Coordinates of C-alpha atoms and ligand atoms in Angstrom, one line a residue:
Chain O
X1 CA -3.4 -33.3 16.8
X2 CA -0.8 -32.5 14.5
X3 CA -2.5 -33.5 11.3
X4 CA -1.2 -31.6 8.9
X5 CA 2.1 -33.3 9.4
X6 CA 3.7 -35.0 6.3
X7 CA 2.4 -32.3 4.1
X8 CA 4.0 -29.7 2.3
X9 CA 1.6 -26.5 1.6
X10 CA 1.9 -23.8 -0.4
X11 CA 0.2 -20.0 0.2
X12 CA -0.2 -16.8 -1.5
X13 CA -0.9 -13.9 0.6
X14 CA -1.6 -9.9 0.7
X15 CA -2.2 -8.0 -2.3
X16 CA -0.7 -7.4 -5.7
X17 CA 0.6 -4.0 -6.8
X18 CA 0.5 -3.2 -10.5
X19 CA 2.9 -1.4 -12.0
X20 CA 2.5 2.4 -13.6
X21 CA 5.4 3.2 -13.2
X22 CA 9.1 3.2 -10.8
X23 CA 6.9 4.9 -8.2
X24 CA 3.2 4.5 -8.8
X25 CA 1.2 1.1 -9.1
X26 CA -3.0 0.2 -8.4
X27 CA -3.0 -2.2 -5.2
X28 CA -5.5 -3.4 -3.4
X29 CA -6.5 -3.0 0.7
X30 CA -6.1 -6.9 1.8
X31 CA -3.5 -6.7 4.4
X32 CA -2.3 -10.5 4.0
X33 CA -2.7 -11.3 7.8
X34 CA -5.6 -14.2 7.1
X35 CA -3.2 -15.8 4.9
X36 CA -0.3 -15.6 6.9
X37 CA -2.7 -17.1 9.8
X38 CA -3.3 -20.3 7.7
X39 CA 0.0 -20.6 7.1
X40 CA 0.8 -20.2 10.6
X41 CA -1.7 -22.8 11.7
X42 CA -0.6 -25.1 9.2
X43 CA 3.4 -24.7 10.2
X44 CA 1.9 -25.2 13.6
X45 CA 0.3 -28.3 13.1
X46 CA 3.1 -29.8 11.1
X47 CA 2.7 -28.8 7.4
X48 CA 5.8 -27.8 5.2
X49 CA 4.8 -24.8 4.5
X50 CA 6.1 -21.9 1.7
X51 CA 4.5 -18.7 2.0
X52 CA 4.8 -16.2 -1.3
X53 CA 3.9 -13.1 0.0
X54 CA 3.1 -9.3 -1.7
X55 CA 2.4 -6.5 0.3
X56 CA 3.5 -7.6 3.3
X57 CA 6.0 -6.0 4.4
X58 CA 5.3 -4.7 8.0
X59 CA 3.5 -8.2 9.3
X60 CA 6.0 -10.9 11.1
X61 CA 7.1 -13.6 8.8
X62 CA 5.2 -16.6 10.3
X63 CA 8.1 -19.2 12.4
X64 CA 8.7 -22.7 10.3
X65 CA 7.6 -21.0 7.1
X66 CA 9.6 -20.3 3.6
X67 CA 9.3 -17.2 2.9
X68 CA 9.4 -15.8 -1.0
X69 CA 8.5 -12.7 -1.9
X70 CA 6.7 -10.7 -5.1
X71 CA 5.1 -7.7 -6.1
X72 CA 2.9 -8.7 -8.9
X73 CA 0.7 -10.7 -9.8
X74 CA 2.5 -11.6 -12.8
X75 CA 5.3 -12.2 -10.5
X76 CA 3.1 -14.4 -8.4
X77 CA 1.7 -16.5 -11.1
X78 CA 5.4 -16.9 -12.2
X79 CA 6.3 -18.1 -8.4
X80 CA 3.1 -20.6 -8.4
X81 CA 3.8 -22.3 -11.3
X82 CA 7.4 -23.0 -9.6
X83 CA 6.7 -23.5 -6.2
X84 CA 3.6 -25.6 -7.0
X85 CA 4.6 -29.3 -8.5
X86 CA 6.2 -29.9 -5.2
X87 CA 3.0 -29.3 -3.2
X88 CA 0.1 -31.4 -2.0
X89 CA -1.9 -28.3 -0.8
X90 CA -2.3 -25.5 -2.6
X91 CA -3.9 -21.8 -1.0
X92 CA -4.8 -18.9 -2.7
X93 CA -5.7 -16.2 0.2
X94 CA -3.5 -13.2 -1.8
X95 CA -5.4 -10.9 -3.1
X96 CA -4.4 -11.1 -7.1
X97 CA -4.8 -7.6 -8.7
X98 CA -7.4 -8.8 -11.6
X99 CA -6.0 -6.1 -13.7
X100 CA -2.3 -4.1 -14.6
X101 CA -2.0 -1.3 -16.2
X102 CA -1.5 -1.8 -20.1
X103 CA 1.7 0.1 -20.4
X104 CA 4.6 0.5 -17.5
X105 CA 6.5 3.8 -17.7
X106 CA 10.2 3.3 -17.7
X107 CA 10.4 6.6 -15.7
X108 CA 7.9 8.3 -13.1
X109 CA 5.3 10.3 -15.2
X110 CA 5.8 13.9 -14.8
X111 CA 2.2 16.1 -13.8
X112 CA 1.0 17.8 -17.4
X113 CA 0.1 21.2 -17.1
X114 CA -2.7 19.9 -20.0
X115 CA -5.6 16.8 -19.0
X116 CA -4.4 13.9 -18.1
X117 CA -4.5 10.4 -19.6
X118 CA -6.0 7.1 -18.6
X119 CA -4.4 4.2 -17.5
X120 CA -5.5 1.6 -20.0
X121 CA -5.7 -2.0 -18.2
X122 CA -5.1 -5.5 -19.1
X123 CA -6.3 -8.7 -17.7
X124 CA -4.0 -10.3 -15.4
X125 CA -4.0 -14.7 -15.6
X126 CA -6.3 -16.2 -13.3
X127 CA -3.5 -18.3 -11.0
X128 CA -6.3 -20.0 -9.6
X129 CA -7.9 -21.5 -12.6
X130 CA -4.7 -22.0 -14.0
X131 CA -3.4 -24.1 -11.1
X132 CA -6.4 -26.4 -11.1
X133 CA -6.2 -26.8 -15.1
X134 CA -2.4 -28.2 -14.5
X135 CA -3.8 -30.5 -12.3
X136 CA -6.5 -31.2 -14.5
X137 CA -4.1 -31.9 -17.5
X138 CA -2.0 -34.2 -15.1
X139 CA 1.2 -31.5 -14.5
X140 CA 0.2 -31.6 -10.6
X141 CA 0.0 -35.5 -9.3
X142 CA 0.9 -34.2 -5.9
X143 CA -1.9 -31.6 -5.5
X144 CA -4.6 -33.2 -3.3
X145 CA -5.9 -30.0 -1.9
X146 CA -6.6 -26.4 -4.0
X147 CA -8.2 -23.8 -2.1
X148 CA -9.6 -20.4 -3.5
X149 CA -10.6 -17.1 -1.5
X150 CA -13.7 -14.9 -2.4
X151 CA -15.1 -12.2 -1.2
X152 CA -19.1 -12.1 -2.0
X153 CA -22.0 -10.0 -0.7
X154 CA -28.1 -14.5 -1.7
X155 CA -24.2 -15.3 -0.6
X156 CA -24.4 -18.9 -2.2
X157 CA -24.9 -18.2 -5.2
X158 CA -22.8 -16.1 -5.6
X159 CA -20.1 -18.5 -3.7
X160 CA -21.6 -21.7 -5.1
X161 CA -20.8 -20.2 -8.5
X162 CA -17.6 -19.6 -7.9
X163 CA -16.7 -22.8 -6.7
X164 CA -17.8 -24.2 -10.3
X165 CA -16.4 -21.7 -12.3
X166 CA -12.9 -22.0 -10.3
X167 CA -13.0 -25.5 -10.1
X168 CA -11.3 -25.9 -6.6
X169 CA -11.5 -28.3 -3.9
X170 CA -12.7 -25.4 -1.6
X171 CA -13.6 -21.7 -1.3
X172 CA -13.5 -19.8 1.9
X173 CA -15.9 -17.5 1.3
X174 CA -15.7 -13.9 3.2
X175 CA -13.2 -14.8 5.6
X176 CA -12.9 -11.2 6.0
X177 CA -12.3 -8.8 9.1
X178 CA -10.4 -8.5 12.3
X179 CA -13.9 -9.0 13.8
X180 CA -12.8 -5.0 15.2
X181 CA -15.0 -3.1 16.6
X182 CA -17.4 -1.1 14.0
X183 CA -16.9 -3.9 11.4
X184 CA -19.9 -4.9 9.7
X185 CA -20.6 -9.0 10.9
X186 CA -22.6 -9.9 7.9
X187 CA -23.2 -13.7 9.3
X188 CA -21.7 -14.3 5.8
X189 CA -18.7 -16.6 6.3
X190 CA -19.1 -20.1 4.6
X191 CA -16.6 -22.8 4.1
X192 CA -17.5 -24.5 0.4
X193 CA -16.7 -27.6 -0.9
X194 CA -16.3 -28.9 -4.1
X195 CA -18.3 -31.9 -2.5
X196 CA -21.2 -29.7 -1.6
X197 CA -20.8 -28.9 2.3
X198 CA -21.4 -26.0 3.4
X199 CA -20.4 -24.3 6.8
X200 CA -20.8 -21.5 8.6
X201 CA -17.4 -19.4 9.2
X202 CA -17.6 -17.9 12.7
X203 CA -16.2 -13.7 12.0
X204 CA -13.8 -14.1 14.7
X205 CA -10.3 -13.8 15.3
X206 CA -7.6 -14.6 11.9
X207 CA -6.5 -17.3 14.0
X208 CA -10.1 -19.0 14.6
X209 CA -10.7 -18.9 10.8
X210 CA -7.5 -20.3 9.8
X211 CA -8.0 -22.9 12.3
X212 CA -12.0 -23.6 10.9
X213 CA -10.0 -23.5 7.5
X214 CA -7.3 -26.1 8.0
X215 CA -9.9 -27.9 9.6
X216 CA -11.4 -28.0 6.7
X217 CA -8.5 -29.0 4.7
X218 CA -7.5 -32.1 6.9
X219 CA -10.6 -33.4 6.6
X220 CA -11.0 -33.2 2.9
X221 CA -7.3 -34.8 2.6
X222 CA -8.8 -37.9 4.7
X223 CA -12.0 -37.9 2.8
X224 CA -9.5 -39.2 -0.2
Chain I
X1 CA 19.4 22.3 22.9
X2 CA 15.0 22.9 22.6
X3 CA 15.7 25.4 19.9
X4 CA 11.9 24.2 18.3
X5 CA 10.7 25.1 21.0
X6 CA 7.3 27.6 20.7
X7 CA 7.1 26.4 17.3
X8 CA 3.6 24.8 15.9
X9 CA 5.1 22.5 13.0
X10 CA 2.4 20.7 10.6
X11 CA 4.1 17.6 8.7
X12 CA 2.8 15.9 6.4
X13 CA 4.5 12.3 5.6
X14 CA 3.5 9.0 3.6
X15 CA 2.0 8.2 0.2
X16 CA -1.4 8.7 -0.3
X17 CA -3.9 6.6 -2.1
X18 CA -6.3 7.3 -4.5
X19 CA -9.8 4.7 -4.3
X20 CA -11.0 3.2 -7.2
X21 CA -13.4 1.2 -5.2
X22 CA -13.4 0.2 -2.0
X23 CA -10.4 -2.6 -2.3
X24 CA -8.2 -0.9 -5.2
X25 CA -6.3 2.4 -5.1
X26 CA -3.8 4.2 -6.9
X27 CA -0.7 4.6 -4.8
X28 CA 3.0 4.8 -4.6
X29 CA 6.3 3.4 -2.8
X30 CA 6.7 5.9 -0.3
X31 CA 7.6 4.6 2.9
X32 CA 6.7 7.9 4.9
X33 CA 10.0 7.2 7.3
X34 CA 11.6 10.7 6.5
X35 CA 8.6 12.5 7.7
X36 CA 8.0 10.6 10.7
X37 CA 11.5 10.8 11.4
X38 CA 11.6 15.0 10.7
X39 CA 8.2 14.8 13.0
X40 CA 9.9 13.1 15.6
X41 CA 13.4 15.3 15.9
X42 CA 11.4 18.5 15.7
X43 CA 8.8 17.6 19.0
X44 CA 12.7 15.9 20.8
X45 CA 13.6 19.5 20.4
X46 CA 10.5 21.1 21.8
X47 CA 8.1 21.8 18.8
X48 CA 4.3 21.3 19.0
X49 CA 3.9 18.8 16.3
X50 CA 1.2 17.3 14.5
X51 CA 1.6 14.9 11.5
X52 CA -0.5 14.1 9.0
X53 CA 0.0 10.7 8.1
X54 CA -0.9 8.4 5.5
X55 CA 0.3 5.3 3.9
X56 CA 3.4 4.1 5.5
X57 CA 5.1 0.9 6.1
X58 CA 4.0 0.2 9.5
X59 CA 5.0 3.4 11.5
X60 CA 4.2 3.3 15.0
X61 CA 3.1 7.3 15.8
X62 CA 6.5 8.9 17.1
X63 CA 5.5 9.6 21.0
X64 CA 4.2 12.9 21.7
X65 CA 2.7 13.7 18.2
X66 CA -0.5 14.6 17.0
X67 CA -1.8 12.2 14.8
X68 CA -4.2 12.9 11.8
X69 CA -4.8 9.9 9.5
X70 CA -5.6 10.6 5.8
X71 CA -6.3 8.2 2.7
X72 CA -6.2 10.4 0.0
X73 CA -4.9 13.5 -1.3
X74 CA -7.7 15.3 -1.5
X75 CA -8.5 14.3 2.7
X76 CA -4.7 15.1 2.7
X77 CA -5.8 18.4 1.4
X78 CA -8.6 19.1 3.5
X79 CA -6.5 18.2 6.4
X80 CA -3.8 20.4 5.8
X81 CA -6.1 23.4 5.3
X82 CA -7.7 22.8 8.5
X83 CA -4.4 22.4 10.4
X84 CA -2.3 25.1 9.0
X85 CA -3.6 28.8 10.4
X86 CA -2.0 27.4 13.1
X87 CA 0.9 26.0 12.0
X88 CA 4.6 27.8 11.7
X89 CA 6.1 25.1 10.0
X90 CA 4.9 23.1 7.2
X91 CA 7.1 20.1 6.0
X92 CA 5.3 18.7 3.3
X93 CA 7.4 15.2 2.9
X94 CA 4.1 13.1 2.0
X95 CA 4.0 11.9 -1.5
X96 CA 1.1 13.5 -2.8
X97 CA -0.6 11.6 -5.5
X98 CA -0.8 13.8 -8.8
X99 CA -4.1 12.2 -10.1
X100 CA -7.0 10.3 -8.9
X101 CA -9.9 8.3 -10.6
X102 CA -12.6 10.3 -11.8
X103 CA -15.2 7.7 -10.5
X104 CA -15.4 6.1 -6.9
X105 CA -17.5 3.1 -6.2
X106 CA -19.4 2.4 -3.2
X107 CA -18.8 -1.1 -3.7
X108 CA -16.6 -3.5 -5.1
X109 CA -16.4 -3.6 -9.0
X110 CA -16.4 -6.7 -10.5
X111 CA -11.3 -3.4 -20.3
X112 CA -11.8 -0.2 -19.3
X113 CA -9.3 2.6 -18.7
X114 CA -9.1 4.4 -15.6
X115 CA -9.9 8.2 -16.4
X116 CA -8.4 10.8 -14.3
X117 CA -8.5 14.2 -12.5
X118 CA -5.6 16.2 -10.8
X119 CA -5.7 16.2 -7.6
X120 CA -5.0 20.2 -5.8
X121 CA -1.2 20.7 -5.2
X122 CA -1.2 21.8 -1.6
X123 CA 2.5 22.6 -1.1
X124 CA 1.8 25.4 -3.9
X125 CA -1.5 26.1 -2.4
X126 CA 0.3 27.0 0.8
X127 CA 3.0 29.2 -0.4
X128 CA 0.5 31.2 -2.6
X129 CA -1.8 31.3 0.4
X130 CA 0.7 32.9 3.2
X131 CA 1.9 35.5 0.1
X132 CA -1.6 36.4 -0.2
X133 CA -1.5 37.7 3.9
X134 CA -3.7 34.4 4.7
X135 CA -1.1 32.6 7.1
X136 CA 0.5 35.2 9.0
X137 CA 1.9 32.5 11.2
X138 CA 3.4 30.6 8.7
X139 CA 7.2 31.3 8.8
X140 CA 9.1 28.3 7.2
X141 CA 7.1 26.1 3.8
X142 CA 9.4 22.9 3.6
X143 CA 8.6 21.4 0.2
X144 CA 10.4 17.5 -0.5
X145 CA 11.4 15.8 -4.1
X146 CA 13.7 13.2 -5.5
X147 CA 15.1 14.0 -8.6
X148 CA 17.5 12.7 -11.4
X149 CA 19.4 13.9 -14.4
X150 CA 17.7 12.7 -17.7
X151 CA 17.9 13.6 -21.1
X152 CA 16.1 17.3 -20.4
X153 CA 18.6 17.9 -17.7
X154 CA 21.1 16.8 -15.1
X155 CA 19.8 15.8 -11.3
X156 CA 20.3 19.7 -9.9
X157 CA 18.9 21.6 -13.0
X158 CA 16.0 19.8 -12.6
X159 CA 15.7 20.2 -8.8
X160 CA 16.7 24.4 -9.1
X161 CA 14.0 24.4 -11.4
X162 CA 11.6 22.2 -8.5
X163 CA 11.9 25.0 -5.8
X164 CA 11.7 28.0 -8.5
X165 CA 8.4 26.6 -9.8
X166 CA 7.3 25.8 -5.8
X167 CA 8.4 29.1 -4.4
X168 CA 9.0 27.2 -1.0
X169 CA 11.6 28.6 1.6
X170 CA 13.6 24.9 1.8
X171 CA 13.5 22.1 -0.8
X172 CA 14.7 18.6 0.8
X173 CA 16.0 17.1 -2.3
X174 CA 16.5 13.4 -2.2
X175 CA 19.2 12.4 -5.9
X176 CA 21.8 8.5 -0.8
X177 CA 22.4 11.9 -0.8
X178 CA 20.9 15.1 -2.2
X179 CA 20.5 18.7 -1.3
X180 CA 19.2 21.7 0.8
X181 CA 18.1 24.3 -1.2
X182 CA 17.1 27.1 -0.1
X183 CA 14.7 30.3 -1.2
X184 CA 17.8 32.7 -0.5
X185 CA 19.9 30.4 -2.8
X186 CA 21.9 28.9 -0.5
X187 CA 22.4 25.0 -1.6
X188 CA 23.9 22.3 1.1
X189 CA 24.9 19.3 0.5
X190 CA 22.7 16.8 2.1
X191 CA 25.2 13.9 3.4
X192 CA 23.8 10.6 3.3
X193 CA 22.7 8.9 6.9
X194 CA 19.8 7.4 8.9
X195 CA 16.7 8.7 8.2
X196 CA 17.0 10.1 12.3
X197 CA 20.3 12.0 11.6
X198 CA 19.3 13.4 8.1
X199 CA 15.8 14.8 10.4
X200 CA 18.6 16.3 12.1
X201 CA 20.2 17.9 9.3
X202 CA 16.7 19.1 8.0
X203 CA 15.5 20.6 11.1
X204 CA 18.7 22.2 11.4
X205 CA 18.3 23.9 8.3
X206 CA 15.0 24.9 9.4
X207 CA 16.5 26.4 12.5
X208 CA 19.1 28.1 10.8
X209 CA 16.3 29.4 8.0
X210 CA 14.0 30.4 11.3
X211 CA 17.1 32.9 12.4
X212 CA 17.3 34.4 9.1
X213 CA 14.2 36.5 10.2
Ligands
CTP301 N1 -5.8 -12.6 -11.5 C1 -5.9 -13.5 -10.3 C2 -7.4 -13.0 -9.8 C3 -7.9 -13.9 -8.5 N2 -7.1 -15.1 -8.4 C4 -7.3 -15.9 -7.0 O1 -8.8 -16.5 -7.3 C5 -9.7 -15.9 -6.0 C6 -10.7 -15.4 -6.6 O2 -11.0 -13.5 -6.7 P1 -11.9 -12.9 -6.6 O3 -11.4 -12.0 -6.0 O4 -12.7 -13.4 -6.5 O5 -11.4 -12.8 -8.4 P2 -12.2 -13.2 -9.7 O6 -12.7 -14.5 -9.1 O7 -11.5 -13.2 -10.5 O8 -13.7 -12.1 -9.5 P3 -14.0 -10.7 -9.4 O9 -13.0 -9.6 -9.6 O10 -14.9 -10.4 -9.9 O11 -14.0 -10.9 -7.7 C7 -9.1 -15.6 -5.3 O12 -8.6 -16.4 -4.3 C8 -7.3 -14.9 -5.9 O13 -6.2 -15.6 -5.2 C9 -6.2 -15.3 -9.1 O14 -5.5 -16.2 -8.7 N3 -5.5 -14.9 -10.2
CTP302 N1 -0.6 17.5 -5.6 C1 0.5 17.1 -4.7 C2 1.7 17.3 -5.6 C3 2.8 17.0 -4.8 N2 2.8 18.1 -3.7 C4 4.0 18.1 -3.0 O1 4.6 18.6 -3.8 C5 6.6 18.7 -3.2 C6 7.2 17.8 -4.7 O2 6.5 17.1 -5.2 P1 7.0 16.5 -6.4 O3 6.0 15.3 -7.0 O4 7.9 16.2 -6.9 O5 6.2 18.1 -7.1 P2 5.7 17.7 -8.8 O6 5.5 19.1 -9.2 O7 4.5 17.1 -8.6 O8 6.8 16.8 -9.5 P3 6.5 16.3 -10.9 O9 5.6 16.6 -11.6 O10 8.1 16.0 -11.2 O11 5.8 14.7 -10.4 C7 6.3 17.6 -2.2 O12 6.8 17.6 -1.0 C8 4.8 16.8 -2.5 O13 4.5 16.6 -0.9 C9 1.7 18.7 -2.9 O14 1.7 19.1 -2.1 N3 0.5 18.1 -3.9
VE6_303 O1 9.6 9.5 3.8 C1 10.6 8.7 3.3 O2 10.4 7.8 3.4 C2 11.6 9.6 2.0 O3 12.8 8.7 2.4 C3 11.1 10.4 1.5 C4 10.3 10.9 0.7 N1 10.5 11.8 -0.3 C5 9.5 12.3 -1.2 C6 8.3 12.5 -0.5 C7 8.0 13.5 -1.7 C8 7.7 13.6 -2.8 O4 6.9 14.1 -3.6 C9 9.1 12.8 -3.2 C10 10.1 12.5 -2.7 C11 11.9 12.6 0.0 C12 12.6 13.3 -0.4 C13 14.2 13.2 -0.1 C14 14.6 12.7 1.1 BR1 16.2 13.0 1.5 C15 13.8 11.8 1.6 C16 12.2 11.5 0.7
CA304 CA1 -10.8 -11.0 -8.5
CA305 CA1 4.2 14.6 -8.6

């Protein structure tokens, strides 16, 4: 079934890198492979896909997908607000850094002979929350589904609450792990819809979870 | 020819990541490509190579090279001190982080500034160790640097200062050229080329410095 034909979808993936200076930064360990798989499965099921990607250099660009490359969280926010009016579906699978260094040095900071000094942090904008607001303010008339991602350690108490605070249509919880040897199986993956259905997310390959996420989107797209 | 036969070489390459927590870290933008190429060229020319590898661009382990994967600079220091007594050549091509977070969370942290503590200088520790008779097999210690000229001095002034302050035998300086600065005062331009070909010039320098003796 090519159930995503006629659907224009925008995906973010990978972690952001918040510059401290031209060489150093604060980043996170997200590989981006899971957002890549969602974009790959969407493209394979007929969607017109644009992928905004962060620290994902060694990944293969998915076939049939339009690539937009960013580095920072603010660049991701700026890139999403550009490509979002055209989308029917937003998939926020990127590990957006919640904070960035408050000051960026123009040159690399030389090692002192005396005490080092801290990196002051500043909040980055909530790209998911901004998109949800834009839609509610009538600014995204094409947006049919907004999908968020979360890593949670009940699970549903934290998961159900993120859904209400972000306000998106679906929250993918704990789609983490490659199902690799000696990675903990917390039987914790859930597909949380704003309508209140909970689906369990079988911790399997990145491809199978992507199929589950895209199954859920098309089913949410048909509910309306 | 196989001019590096009989030589045990210990190489660091890539940047380190200093954890804040299981997800976040302080990192740098070093790709590691030039240390890997140095490790690849040394092996091909007969050396027994151990490559201590940190964060890379997704690089494949060079064939025939013993790989040690590290994450942090502290882990990198432990790995170097563990393998150094056996080595004849140390090539410090890793972008070792100067500072690390003062606290590491075991779980993910949901204004605070990040307090930092200084990391050990592994290249300098190696130079002092050799001079203290603790590394009798060490024949060459090679450091790496990327230097710019600025309001405080030109590129070459800053690079020489690095060699003089680090005390190593050879300093491979990037300014896409740069220089090869030797402890005898020899300064060669580093002709730009591929990572492979520039690695060839670096090893030729090491070989030529090994014949110094
Ligand atoms: N500055 C941010 C931070 C996160 N996100 C998005 O919001 C979702 C939730 O990410 P999460 O890591 O849970 O961050 P927070 O919800 O802000 O909370 P916490 O940092 O406590 O985990 C993710 O899909 C991410 O793409 C975002 O758009 N902008
Ligand atoms: N904690 C550190 C920092 C640097 N290095 C090594 O030292 C050499 C020089 O790196 P560089 O950062 O240029 O020297 P620094 O004194 O840290 O330079 P600066 O103060 O300008 O940042 C490199 O081979 C690197 O592998 C190291 O062994 N341990
Ligand atoms: O490995 C790579 O990808 C790479 O290109 C290089 C990294 N550094 C580097 C290492 C640690 C440091 O502290 C400063 C600079 C280099 C220095 C000279 C040349 Br020539 C090349 C590199
Ligand atoms: Ca977050
Ligand atoms: Ca430094």
